[PDB]
């Protein structure tokens, strides 16, 4: 039950994330997807990998949220990627910090997220797991790459869309030093923690080559597909949204129905009947 | 922020409650940390008390 709950959670939250326009919302759904992945890790009887991923995710997700907050403060409380743009050169340090955090989140082959996410994916593939849970975990990894691509593409690449009065200034020592401290951890802390902890489980030494590359292959595939779809936005071609897009953008309609129907019935029963 | 001191106090209180939750050895203390981080989340989400969406 834990494995299935984690799988559905990570898939659903990533799918909702890949089409949000609020950067804080995207980072929140990424956090939810990582929590679902951790719950999947617990469900396959790998409790220590879950804790390792807790630590690594704490590092790079905290840095990502700090970079998002720096962007928001620079652009005068603007939390819309549709209004961000040009920040790759407008803000160098937050740009490189966010790129490093996104690479660590998606499982860059030797960053902090590699020493937890890669082992989690290998354990999922190599265990006696639910087939649907495994498939949803792989799709969630691809969608993680997808929404990281969306964040970078709509926040730093392209031409500016913010109001003309440029108040961009990221030269504060407090911000720079805090991001620096959380940035060295996002690169080196995974290696140190992995090499210092005692072996808490038997490693998966023998496995097929394609199954070893499963995390990297799906990450690259998600990167490429999301990049192509985002590049299609430049075309002078306008098309109405699809049913799948409406479902994904509106959070699967779960907040609407589940926040309007049960609450209405309970409150109506509270006064009309009781 | 006019109440940045209170904001830092709330952050420290959340840190204390999280440490209690993590280091708790028995279920009652774990529940103490549980509810402490829950109530600190409630207090910090609705930081701007004039915002209906925050409430």
């Amino acid at each position: 039950m834990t494995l299935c709950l984690g799988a559905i959670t990570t898939l659903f939250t990533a799918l909702c994330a890949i089409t949000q326009n609020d950067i804080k919302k995207i980072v929140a759904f990424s956090t939810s997807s990582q929590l679902g992945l951790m719950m999947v890790t617990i469900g396959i009887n790998q409790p220590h990998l879950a804790f390792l991923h807790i630590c690594m995710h704490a590092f790079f997700k905290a840095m990502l949220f700090m970079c998002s907050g720096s962007i928001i403060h620079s652009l005068n409380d603007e939390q819309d990627i549709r209004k961000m743009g040009g920040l790759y050169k407008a803000m160098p340090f937050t740009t490189t910090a966010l790129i490093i955090g996104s690479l660590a989140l998606t499982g860059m082959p030797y960053l902090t997220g590699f020493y937890s996410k890669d082992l989690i994916i290998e354990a999922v593939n190599m265990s006696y797991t639910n087939a649907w849970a495994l498939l949803m975990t792989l799709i969630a990894t691809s969608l993680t790459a997808a929404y990281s691509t969306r964040i970078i593409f709509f926040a730093f690449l392209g031409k500016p869309r913010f109001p003309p009065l440029v108040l961009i200034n990221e030269n504060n020592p407090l911000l720079i030093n805090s991001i620096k401290r959380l940035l060295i951890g996002s690169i080196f802390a995974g290696f140190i923690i992995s090499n210092n902890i005692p072996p808490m489980t038997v490693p998966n030494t023998t496995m097929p080559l394609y199954m070893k590359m499963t995390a990297l292959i799906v990450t690259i595939m998600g990167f490429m597909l999301a990049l192509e779809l985002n590049n299609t936005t430049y075309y002078l071609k306008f098309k109405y949204p699809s049913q799948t897009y409406k479902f994904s953008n509106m959070l699967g309609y779960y907040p609407s129905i589940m926040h309007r129907l049960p609450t209405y019935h309970n409150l109506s029963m509270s006064q009309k009947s009781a | 922020d006019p109440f940045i001191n209170r904001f830092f106090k709330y952050l420290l209180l959340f840190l204390i409650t999280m440490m209690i939750l993590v280091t708790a050895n028995n279920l009652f203390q774990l529940f103490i940390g549980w509810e402490g981080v829950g109530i600190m989340s409630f207090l910090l989400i609705g930081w701007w008390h004039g915002r209906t969406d925050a409430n």
């Binding site: 006696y128 797991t129 639910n130 409406k246 509106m250 699967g252 209405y264 409150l267 | -």
Partner: protein, 104 residues
């Protein structure tokens, strides 16, 4: 009150009410902190159908995956001393059924 006009200069801006105008019987239920009835981009029936279909499909596919799991072409793992009889809490006085693992 969420449906009510946000830009109007209400006497109670947060509640979106004017002084003296009749109050709805369910105002305590229709405040902006409570149940919302504003129109949605998608029909309520369509939203309900899509949400129920998605969750039912996920449950059905989880059951199907449970009855058709995924594993690896390996046999059971082997442990030395009668599948770790004493280490897992076996009775020292009672003799366990011997378990022998051979080479291959």
């Amino acid at each position: 009150q969420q449906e009510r006009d946000p830009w109007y200069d209400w006497d109670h801006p947060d509640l979106r009410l004017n002084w003296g105008e009749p109050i709805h019987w369910d105002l305590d239920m229709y405040i902006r902190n409570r149940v919302d009835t504003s129109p949605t981009p998608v029909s309520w029936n369509t939203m309900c159908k899509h949400l129920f279909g998605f969750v039912a499909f996920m449950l059905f596919m989880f059951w199907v995956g449970e009855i058709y799991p995924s594993y690896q072409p390996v046999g059971p793992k082997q442990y030395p001393y009668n599948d770790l009889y004493l280490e897992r809490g076996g009775d020292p006085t009672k003799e366990p059924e011997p378990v022998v693992h051979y080479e291959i």
